[PDB]
Design a binder for this molecule. Structure first.
Ligand SMILES: N=NC(=O)c1ccncc1
Ligand SMILES: N=NC(=O)c1ccncc1
Lengths: 269, 273
């Protein structure tokens, strides 16, 4: 189901090329969305059963713990070695802003035939990595889209991307592997705390070969070369239509919740 | 006069009867086919000659667009050739002006058309740009009239008629005009002003527009706005290179026509004006 979900064909071999191919296909096939937290449905269970059920069988997307959770289990089953890492999102944050919570989950992946480790992150939303990169401080690393770079200060790593010119820090992380329960505590926080960006509004995102799409409330942003594109939807009806048809999210397991009404309340949050 | 060339330019064919159904079809075909654009004035090339020969050579033979005098000029000659009776009218653009702002210059030209088989006259205007009329409407003050897009309304005070459009729920006055028919030379004096005065909107920046069944497209400098049913899009081009690509490939305008003028360098000066 997963391979089909992402449009790949059989069982691929556990090597570096496969990692590049699964990331690409994951990127364009499973959207980032927070419809469950938006509707008061916690993301509490990060088991394989729960994640496969939601992101594969029911054709929903999810946020970082759901995406990277799922990819983690997929890659393990193919024969990669996978450690789950946690980090703090520093994107666009004022210098001297307080230390952010650990709200992001990424993968450190070891690949038979390769020597070190790879940062894999398909769950960061509209600016997520679209290639695995080497878990190596220093070099500017090319991806399918913009250049990225890791730096290191002690045991803290920062991922930065060169976005429309500028070098922007995205998040910091340590390479300490996390047990699933510690990820579940963080996911409980991100999906239920009243000040979470994922509780107060709607975020949907996906990445094709040519563009990064990012929807917040009524505002769809599209980033491609030479141009930034901003679509403002008139009402919740158009936003749902974009959720279902543009972003490919199946709303069937949410039957009996007033999705449109909730979306209407968060068009401008 | 090359009637068949014009009809071909606008995606039509045959020779239609001079009736109301034909007036609607030619307006909708012109709206989607011949863009609003001011490249000539932007590049210091005046729009001075409003003869049928000049407007046909530019807007039909050369696959350029133009601004109001050129559009409604061309359409006016086509419409007489088909057997409509046509008067050219001038007006003053009031779109978004303060209540206290000085009287505007007469910088807009529209058509008042008698249609065989219909009572009264029709206002026809394919030349106002992205918010131009997409149907002929009855030149009748009072009622709200439907078009292929938004409701529009004419009101009257003295010898001034105001055209307003209901734009996303809000009534906006576009321009005022009188029904005094204008000779070509009065239009030409107006077009001279609009295409050469250093404070003209069409001299200090770039405006490109086209209207399809589903959307109004409006480009000012680097910003492309698209109004569709249920959404607006705002595309911001990074530089003049992307703006030219839009002009050529999205709006279908042939720039080979302006060779030797460095279009890109001039558009690079007006991305934000
Ligand atoms: N779960 N957290 C996330 O998905 C996330 C948090 C912050 N920024 C992008 C993504
Ligand atoms: N010639 N004038 C025009 O083309 C025009 C003037 C004002 N607003 C839109 C279009």
């Amino acid at each position: 189901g997963y391979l089909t979900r992402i449009g790949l064909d059989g069982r691929p071999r556990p090597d570096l090329g496969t990692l590049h191919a699964i990331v690409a296909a994951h990127n364009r096939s499973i959207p980032f969305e927070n419809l469950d937290p938006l509707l008061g449905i916690p993301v509490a269970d990060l088991s394989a059963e729960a994640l496969f059920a939601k992101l594969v069988d029911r054709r929903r997307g999810g946020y970082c713990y759901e995406h990277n959770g799922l990819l983690g289990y997929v890659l393990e089953e193919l024969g990669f070695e996978v450690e789950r890492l946690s980090g703090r999102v520093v994107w666009m944050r004022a210098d001297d802003a307080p230390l952010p919570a650990q709200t992001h989950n990424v993968l450190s992946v070891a690949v038979p035939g390769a020597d070190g480790r790879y940062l894999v992150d398909v769950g960061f939303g509209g600016q997520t990595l679209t290639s695995p990169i080497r878990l190596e401080a220093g070099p500017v690393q090319q991806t399918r889209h913009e250049p990225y770079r890791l730096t290191r200060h002690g045991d803290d790593h920062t991922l930065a991307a060169q976005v429309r010119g500028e070098w922007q820090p995205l998040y910091t992380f340590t390479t300490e592997p996390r047990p699933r329960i510690d990820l579940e505590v963080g996911s409980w926080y991100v999906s239920t705390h009243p000040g979470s960006h994922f509780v107060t509004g709607l975020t949907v995102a996906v990445v094709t070969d040519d563009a990064r799409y990012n929807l917040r409330g009524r505002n769809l942003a599209v980033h491609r070369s030479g141009a930034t594109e901003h679509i403002r939807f008139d009402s919740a009806a158009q936003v749902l239509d974009a959720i279902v048809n543009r972003f490919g999210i199946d709303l069937g397991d949410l039957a009996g919740r007033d999705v449109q009404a909730r979306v209407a309340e968060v068009l401008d949050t």
